[PDB]
Amino acid sequence: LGTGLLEALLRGDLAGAEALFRRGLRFWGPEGVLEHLLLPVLREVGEAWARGEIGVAEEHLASTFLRARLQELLDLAGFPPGPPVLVTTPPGERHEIGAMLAAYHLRRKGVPALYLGPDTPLPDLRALARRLGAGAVVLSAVLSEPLRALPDGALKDLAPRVFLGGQGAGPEEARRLGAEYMEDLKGLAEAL
Amino acid sequence: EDLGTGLLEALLRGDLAGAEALFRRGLRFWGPEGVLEHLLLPVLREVGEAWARGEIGVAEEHLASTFLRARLQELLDLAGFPPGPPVLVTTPPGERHEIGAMLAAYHLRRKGVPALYLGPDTPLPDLRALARRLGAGAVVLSAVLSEPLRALPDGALKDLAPRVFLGGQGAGPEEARRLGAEYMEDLKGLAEAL
Amino acid sequence: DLGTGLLEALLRGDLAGAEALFRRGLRFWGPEGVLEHLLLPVLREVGEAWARGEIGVAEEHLASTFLRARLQELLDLAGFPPGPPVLVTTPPGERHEIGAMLAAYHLRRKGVPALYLGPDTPLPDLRALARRLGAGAVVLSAVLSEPLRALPDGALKDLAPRVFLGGQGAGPEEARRLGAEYMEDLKGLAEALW
Amino acid sequence: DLGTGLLEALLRGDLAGAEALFRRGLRFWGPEGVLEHLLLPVLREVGEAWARGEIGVAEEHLASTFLRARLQELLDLAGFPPGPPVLVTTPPGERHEIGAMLAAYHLRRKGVPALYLGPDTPLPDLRALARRLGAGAVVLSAVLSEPLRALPDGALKDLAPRVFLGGQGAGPEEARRLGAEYMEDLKGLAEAL
Ligand code: B12
Ligand code: B12
Ligand code: B12
Ligand code: B12
Ligand SMILES: C[C@H]1O[C@@H](n2cnc3c(N)ncnc32)[C@H](O)[C@@H]1O
Ligand SMILES: C[C@H]1O[C@@H](n2cnc3c(N)ncnc32)[C@H](O)[C@@H]1O
Ligand SMILES: C[C@H]1O[C@@H](n2cnc3c(N)ncnc32)[C@H](O)[C@@H]1O
Ligand SMILES: C[C@H]1O[C@@H](n2cnc3c(N)ncnc32)[C@H](O)[C@@H]1O
Numbered sequence: 141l142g143t144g145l146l147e148a149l150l151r152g153d154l155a156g157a158e159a160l161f162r163r164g165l166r167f168w169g170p171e172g173v174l175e176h177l178l179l180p181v182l183r184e185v186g187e188a189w190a191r192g193e194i195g196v197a198e199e200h201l202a203s204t205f206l207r208a209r210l211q212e213l214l215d216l217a218g219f220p221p222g223p224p225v226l227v228t229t230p231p232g233e234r235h236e237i238g239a240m241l242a243a244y245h246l247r248r249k250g251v252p253a254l255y256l257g258p259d260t261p262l263p264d265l266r267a268l269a270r271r272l273g274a275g276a277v278v279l280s281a282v283l284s285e286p287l288r289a290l291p292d293g294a295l296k297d298l299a300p301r302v303f304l305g306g307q308g309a310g311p312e313e314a315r316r317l318g319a320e321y322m323e324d325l326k327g328l329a330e331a332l
Numbered sequence: 333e334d335l336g337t338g339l340l341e342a343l344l345r346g347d348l349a350g351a352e353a354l355f356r357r358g359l360r361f362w363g364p365e366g367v368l369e370h371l372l373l374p375v376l377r378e379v380g381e382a383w384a385r386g387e388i389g390v391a392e393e394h395l396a397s398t399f400l401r402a403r404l405q406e407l408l409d410l411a412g413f414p415p416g417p418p419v420l421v422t423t424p425p426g427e428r429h430e431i432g433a434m435l436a437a438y439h440l441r442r443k444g445v446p447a448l449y450l451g452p453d454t455p456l457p458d459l460r461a462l463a464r465r466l467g468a469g470a471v472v473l474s475a476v477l478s479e480p481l482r483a484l485p486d487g488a489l490k491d492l493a494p495r496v497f498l499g500g501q502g503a504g505p506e507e508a509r510r511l512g513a514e515y516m517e518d519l520k521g522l523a524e525a526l
Numbered sequence: 527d528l529g530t531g532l533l534e535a536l537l538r539g540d541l542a543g544a545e546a547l548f549r550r551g552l553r554f555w556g557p558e559g560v561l562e563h564l565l566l567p568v569l570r571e572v573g574e575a576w577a578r579g580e581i582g583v584a585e586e587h588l589a590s591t592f593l594r595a596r597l598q599e600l601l602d603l604a605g606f607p608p609g610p611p612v613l614v615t616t617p618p619g620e621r622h623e624i625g626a627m628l629a630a631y632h633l634r635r636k637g638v639p640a641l642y643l644g645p646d647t648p649l650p651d652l653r654a655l656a657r658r659l660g661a662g663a664v665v666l667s668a669v670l671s672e673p674l675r676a677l678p679d680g681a682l683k684d685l686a687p688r689v690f691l692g693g694q695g696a697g698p699e700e701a702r703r704l705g706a707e708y709m710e711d712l713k714g715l716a717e718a719l720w
Numbered sequence: 721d722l723g724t725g726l727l728e729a730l731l732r733g734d735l736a737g738a739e740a741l742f743r744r745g746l747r748f749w750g751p752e753g754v755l756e757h758l759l760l761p762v763l764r765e766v767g768e769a770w771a772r773g774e775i776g777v778a779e780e781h782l783a784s785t786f787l788r789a790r791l792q793e794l795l796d797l798a799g800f801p802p803g804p805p806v807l808v809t810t811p812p813g814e815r816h817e818i819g820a821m822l823a824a825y826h827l828r829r830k831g832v833p834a835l836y837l838g839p840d841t842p843l844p845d846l847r848a849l850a851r852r853l854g855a856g857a858v859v860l861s862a863v864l865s866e867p868l869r870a871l872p873d874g875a876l877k878d879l880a881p882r883v884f885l886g887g888q889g890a891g892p893e894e895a896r897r898l899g900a901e902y903m904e905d906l907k908g909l910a911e912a913l
Contacts, residue, residue, distance in 0.1 A: 152835055155798045166603040167557075169549050170410060176553075182888045197841050197849035200809070204838035206790050215789065216364060218412030219735045220444025228781070250414025250444040254733050256778055257785035264776035275840045346641055348606045360797040361751075363743050389651035390658045391643055392686035394615070398644035400604065407593050409545075418539045424589070444589050451591035454584050466539045 142180050149202045150194070161209050170248070174241060178206050202236070210240050214255065217247035223275040225251055225279035226268060226299065226331065229291065230260040230279055230286040238280035238306045242325055246278070249329035253278070262294060269299040276332060279319070281308035287317065295319040295327055303328060335361075336374050343396045344388070355403050361418075366406055366444070368435060372400050376431065399432070404434050408449065411441035417469040417526065419445055420462060420493065423452040424473055424480040432474035432500045436519055441470070443523035447472070456488060463493040470495035470526060473513065475502035481511065489513040497522060529567050536589045537581070548596055557600055558635075561628065561710040564595050569624065591623070597627050601642065606632035612638055612719065613655060613686065617666055617673040623691045625667030636716030640665070651682060656686040660681055663688040663719055666674040666706065668695035674704065677695070682706040688719060721763050727846040730762075731775065741792055751794050751829075759787050763818065781893045784800045784818070791796065791821050795836065798828035806832055806913070807850050807880070810839040811867040819861035819887045822906055825839070830910035834859070842876055856881035857913060860900065862889035869900065876900040884909060 141164045148157040151235060186201045188194045208299075229241040236258035238263075246253035256265075269277055277299040281287050287308060293300050296318030304319035305324040314321035322328055335358045341353040358371040379396045382388045421437040422429060428451035442449035450462075463471055471493040475481050481502060489496050490512030498513035499522075508515035516522055528547045535543035551560040572589045575581045613712055614630040616623060623645040633640035641661075643652075655662055664686040668674050674695060682689050683705025691706035692715075701708035722745045729737035745758040766783045769775045808815060808824040817839035827834035835853075837846075850858055858879040862868050868889060876883050877899030885900035888907075895902035903909055 143723060150852075152337070152805050154835070163603060166599050167552060169545060172549050173555075195845035195848045197807070197809075197837055197845040200838040200841055201835065203850070204836060207838075208796065211789050211792060213410065215739075216407065216410040218414075218442050218444045220414075220737075224733050226778070228778075248412045250412045250416075250446070252444070254735065254782065256781040257788075259776050260781055264778040267776050268778035268782075272364075292809075348641065354619050357797060361746065362794050363739060366743055389648075389654050391613070391615075391647050391655035394643040394647055396643065397653070398642060401644075402598050405598060409595060413541045420584070422584075447537075448541070449591060450587040451582055451594075454587055455582075458582035458584040462544040462580050462588070506570065 141177055142184070145177065146184065146202065149205060150198055152201075153161040157205060158209075161206075169247075173251075174210065174213075174244070176189050179211065182206060189269060190299075193197050207237060207240070208319055210237060210244065214240060214244050217244060218250055219247060219251045220250055222252055224254040225239050225276045226256060226265065226272075227253050227277060227278045227280075228260040228265060229252065230281055230290065231261050232286035233281060233283060233308070234258055234328065235282035238246060238282055239278070242305070242328060246326040246329055246332070251329060251332055259278050262290075262298065268300050274299050276303060278328065279302045280306075280310075281306040284308040284313070287313050290317055292316055293318045301332070303331065335371055338453060340375050340378060340396065344392055346395070348399065350368070351399060352403075365439070367409075368404065368438070371372060372404065373430075373436070376400060380521050390438070401431060404431065404438065407462055408434060408438050408441065411438060412444060414444055414446045416446055417467050418448040419470045419472060419476075420450060420466075420468050421431065421472045422450040422454040424457060424475055424484065425453060425455050426480035426483060427475060427477060429474075429476035432476055433472070436472050436474055436522060439519040440523055440526070442460055445523055445526055455485070456484075456492065460492050468493050470497065472497045473499075473503075473520065475484055475500040478507070480500040483509050486510055487512045495526070497525065527563075529564055529571070532564065533568050533571060533589065536592055537585055541587070541592070544592060545569060547682055550711065553557065557603075561597070561600075561631075568637040569593060572680040594627070597624060599630065601627060601631045601634065606634065607637050607639045608642075609639050610660050610674060611641040612663040612665055613643055613652065613653060613659075613661050614665045614667075615643040615647040616638050617668055617677065618646060618667060619673040620670060620695070621645055622667075622669035625669055626665070629665050629667055629692070629715060632712040632715055633719070638716050649677075649685065651697055653685045661686050663690060665690045665715065666692075671700070674700050677704055679703055680705040690715065691720065722758055722806070723765070726758065727762050727765060727783065729777055730786055734784070734913070738786060751797070754775050755791070755794070755825075755840045785858055788818060788821070791818060791825065795821060795825050795828065798825055800828065800835075801831050801833045803833050804854050804856045805835040806859060807837060807846065807853070808834050808853045808859045808861075809837040809841040809846060809872065810861050810863070811844050812840060813870060814862060814889070815839055816863035816865060819863055820859070821851075823859050823909060826906040827910055828913075829865065832910055832913060837889040842845035843879065845873070847879050852905060855880050857884065859884045859909065860886075860890075865889040865891075865894070871898055873897050882913065884912065 141199040145160045164173040168176045185199045189199050227239050229239050243253040243255040302319045303322045304314045311321045339354045358367040362370050379393045383393050421433050423433050437447040437449040496513045498508045499516040499517050505515045528551050532547045548576050551564045576586050615627050615628050629638035630642040689706045690709050692699045692709040698708045722741055745754040749757050755862045764774040770780050808820050810820050824834035854896050883900040885895045885901045886903040892902045
């Protein structure tokens with residue numbers, strides 16, 4: 141399915157790509173299709189670009205497509221009432237699908253995760269959390285560099301709980317920034 | 333808007349692929365709740381009226397119903413299922429119309445309530461035992477027909493769970509009161525009351 | 527074996543856990559394997575446990591409703607090819623539908639357009655739909671024997687150009703009396719029709 | 721006003737309410753109409769409110785992300801017809817993507833297979849994908865002027881046999897310098913093809 145989907149995308153067959161994604165969804169289930177189809181295809185797109193096998197426009201097409209599929213699943217999940225959890229990425233972080241995954245996992249567990257989009261200045265994020273009485277903020281870091289650019293303690297009081305995760309993040313950097321480090325998306329809902 | 337006619341027609345000619353495409357269009361246009369209200373419900377109602385007029389047979393209704401039930405079940409599984417005390421959702425003994433109960437479960441889950449849809453037609457002692465064993469916060473019943481409610485003794489629903497809700501075309505305030513359930517008119521009011 | 531874990535998760539209302547275990551079975555054993563080694567044994571065990579007084583009706587309902595939804599997913603994934611449809615249902619008075627769903631699944635897996643109607647379809651209505659859609663066959667699942675016994679000699683004979691009957695409620699003798707082709711194995715079905 | 725209601729629902733993080741109001745607009749105005757009467761005015765007002773210091777970036781982000789999801793839904797509902805595709809994106813350094821999405825939507829609604837790439841595509845990569853898909857045209861949305869100004873003379877030439885440039889950041893003179901056809905109106909796009 142992963143191969144088929146990427147091949148369909150690279151020949152501009154959006155309809156066929158959508159059918160293959162839906163097949164993955166029916167077999168693996170919602171979480172499973174993300175783990176077994178969406179994530180491996182995105183990773184492979186990145187590796188192929190890095191090896192010079194595809195260009196940026198091919199990656200863009202695939203990413204935009206898979207982002208739309210995840211957004212579909214996100215809107216089909218519950219959005220419960222009550223204090224929201226704000227989900228975004230650090231300033232300078234333009235990879236948004238990890239944040240979307242975090243929001244999706246939370247919503248699937250009945251947590252009102254408000255996905256903001258990526259790349260939110262910290263004072264503005266803090267102000268929104270405060271004004272909505274958000275119980276937590278969740279950040280996805282794909283790159284390490286946006287975290288490195290932040291001063292010590294910069295995440296510390298965005299909200300009563302601040303969670304940081306993603307391939308760009310680690311325990312030490314979380315500690316330096318004053319966030320709780322989370323390894324697994326499934327641990328997020330537990331923590332809340 | 334022509335989607336309802338198109339969907340029914342596709343179903344009646346056994347074009348499941350076409351019917352699925354039309355349902356998906358409705359979903360994209362109206363949203364999850366909207367497609368149920370503006371496509372699924374009107375088509376089922378019209379199927380019932382056509383049958384009652386003698387215009388279609390039972391097999392046609394069955395085909396349509398089975399299809400729409402599967403679409404709603406898809407939406408149900410895509411909604412959140414949170415942890416915590418469940419709400420048990422079913423229909424009264426003798427009530428075999430299940431789509432209203434499925435709708436109730438769907439609306440609850442979309443609002444973050446862990447609605448366990450049991451299927452239809454659950455004996456009251458067995459329902460009570462499951463509620464007790466799972467420590468359910470509530471039971472919700474959909475009554476499409478009035479007759480299964482009329483067959484129940486006064487107060488029969490009273491303490492199935494700490495909260496008991498009754499709704500559907502078969503139910504009214506008076507009958508709810510006689511049976512000891514809280515009457516709900518709107519599916520949207522269900523999540524609120526909880 | 528995931529069957530115990532799955533049933534246990536279901537009985538405590540852990541839908542997420544139940545779904546994870548079913549998906550694990552799917553990934554390890556595949557669609558056909560999970561039906562034979564997980565779905566069918568759990569349904570059988572649910573029946574035996576009810577019969578022995580160990581679980582109530584609401585527990586069975588929850589498990590059945592869950593597995594029915596999973597099978598409906600597999601049914602839609604097996605796809606609906608073009609061509610004359612095969613109508614799949616159960617006899618009048620037969621409300622156990624999962625056997626019919628299995629038959630539709632096995633047919634679709636072999637490229638046959640099996641239209642699942644849902645259960646419990648009156649024979650004249652079934653015959654009329656088969657005729658109007660130009661169905662090449664009708665397939666019936668009988669779980670109980672009583673609905674078959676209630677039918678007159680030859681009642682299944684001419685529902686469609688080919689009529690197939692199977693399930694635990696059916697046997698060769700009763701199939702012959704009713705004028706249907708008796709089938710034991712679901713995998714033999716597509717070959718018999720071919 | 722649905723526009724006021726929708727913005728207010730978004731600003732207080734009421735996604736359910738926001739979705740209901742958007743759906744009402746969609747049912748009343750239809751797909752085209754909801755874009756013109758609801759989606760576009762709200763985005764414009766979000767921009768003005770930010771610029772006046774009335775809302776922060778996180779509020780704009782929430783509104784934009786919501787409307788982008790709704791437009792992506794409309795895009796997929798308009799369908800993706802067969803045939804040589806038209807690639808739709810924004811210039812390198814242009815991160816405003818909703819104009820490009822609109823262009824793709826209008827084209828698809830007229831039966832043109834507009835493949836929306838996402839924003840911010842380097843031109844050699846865009847050229848390669850157009851070539852590989854045998855795309856008949858490329859369409860670019862420029863919201864800012866600066867990403868166009870950074871490009872060399874003729875940089876948009878021959879991305880495909882037809883290259884269209886539009887948006888608030890674009891003008892006839894800059895289109896000419898870059899070797900694109902300038903387009904003012906989204907509805908004129910399908911006509912031009
Ligand atoms: C798509 C993509 C882009 C797109 C993103 C589009 C979008 N709107 O989202 C665009 C074009 C913007 C892009 C740009 C760039 N990217 Co890029 N791209 C990717 C790609 C192909 C996929 C991204 C993705 O969605 N992955 C899915 C991710 C999130 O999954 P994951 O990290 O495995 O996440 C898991 C866990 O971390 C967990 N998780 C994630 N978030 C969180 C949060 C919490 C709280 C928790 C508990 C868990 C959790 O969830 C996942 C489940 O397993 C990756 C390839 C890859 N990821 O390996 C790169 C990649 C990240 N990009 C890379 C690069 C180099 C770039 C650019 C610098 C390129 C450039 N010169 O322009 C820019 C940087 C832009 C920026 N400042 O952010 C590199 C980074 C390598 C590195 N760190 O050294 C990668 C790895 C590609 C590669 N092989 O070289 N990219
Ligand atoms: C499909 C169908 C069947 C199917 C059901 C299949 C299944 N597995 O669900 C089957 C074949 C089993 C069936 C059988 C029969 N049914 Co029938 N059938 C229908 C049909 C076409 C659609 C049912 C449906 O799903 N509708 C969608 C429902 C849920 O919408 P709704 O009821 O309007 O619900 C809305 C609200 O009431 C609310 N709601 C619902 N439940 C709840 C619960 C709460 C708490 C809340 C707040 C709200 C709420 O939400 C919905 C959206 O707004 C209807 C036609 C119709 N107009 O309803 C009949 C209909 C209900 N059936 C009818 C009849 C007569 C029968 C049979 C007696 C026929 C027969 N002799 O065999 C049997 C009875 C079986 C039994 N119950 O014991 C009649 C009932 C007439 C009456 N009471 O006056 C109807 C109305 C058809 C007609 N026009 O005559 N039926
Ligand atoms: C779920 C269930 C129900 C559900 C069904 C829900 C639904 N929407 O489908 C409900 C709650 C409605 C129900 C009700 C009742 N049921 Co019940 N229940 C079951 C249960 C637990 C599973 C049903 C199922 O899906 N079975 C799985 C089937 C598909 O597997 P299988 O029978 O082994 O079939 C194999 C082959 O036959 C083949 N196959 C099946 N069909 C076909 C068709 C063809 C063409 C081919 C080639 C092959 C084939 O596939 C399988 C393996 O390869 C069974 C237990 C069981 N079956 O062992 C009972 C069971 C069938 N029910 C039983 C009873 C007693 C009842 C009721 C009378 C209970 C009552 N109310 O008093 C009612 C009758 C309803 C009616 N039909 O009129 C009993 C007894 C049947 C009997 N003859 O003795 C059973 C066996 C449980 C028990 N141990 O007592 N039931
Ligand atoms: C949402 C938004 C963002 C988001 C975008 C998210 C996303 N993924 O798309 C983010 C946060 C990324 C953002 C960032 C910035 N943006 Co901004 N933001 C906006 C906002 C509020 C809406 C954008 C939008 O979708 N507009 C809808 C567009 C399509 O509306 P439109 O103008 O009516 O477009 C019409 C026509 O041009 C036509 N059209 C559009 N494209 C095309 C193409 C063709 C071929 C055709 C025929 C027609 C056509 O169709 C539309 C309807 O008729 C606008 C407000 C605005 N007035 O546009 C700004 C705005 C564009 N942003 C602005 C600024 C300053 C920024 C930043 C520099 C801020 C900063 N300091 O970081 C950055 C720059 C990032 C970059 N490199 O691109 C300013 C630009 C002012 C200027 N040009 O000097 C605006 C106007 C806000 C303001 N009032 O000050 N922004
Ligand atoms: C990590 C992803 O970033 C994309 N990428 C690499 N360079 C650029 C650029 N200049 N502009 C936009 N996207 C880029 C590639 O397609 C890669 O797959
Ligand atoms: C309410 C629905 O009940 C169905 N219906 C009517 N009579 C029967 C029967 N004998 N068996 C099964 N379903 C029946 C019809 O299809 C109608 O539309
Ligand atoms: C075959 C299955 O039928 C279910 N069953 C038994 N009696 C009833 C009833 N009155 N109503 C609904 N389901 C019932 C049991 O759960 C058993 O497991
Ligand atoms: C044009 C839009 O850009 C957003 N915006 C302004 N500055 C930044 C920044 N540093 N990072 C991210 N988004 C920003 C604002 O929210 C404005 O509404």
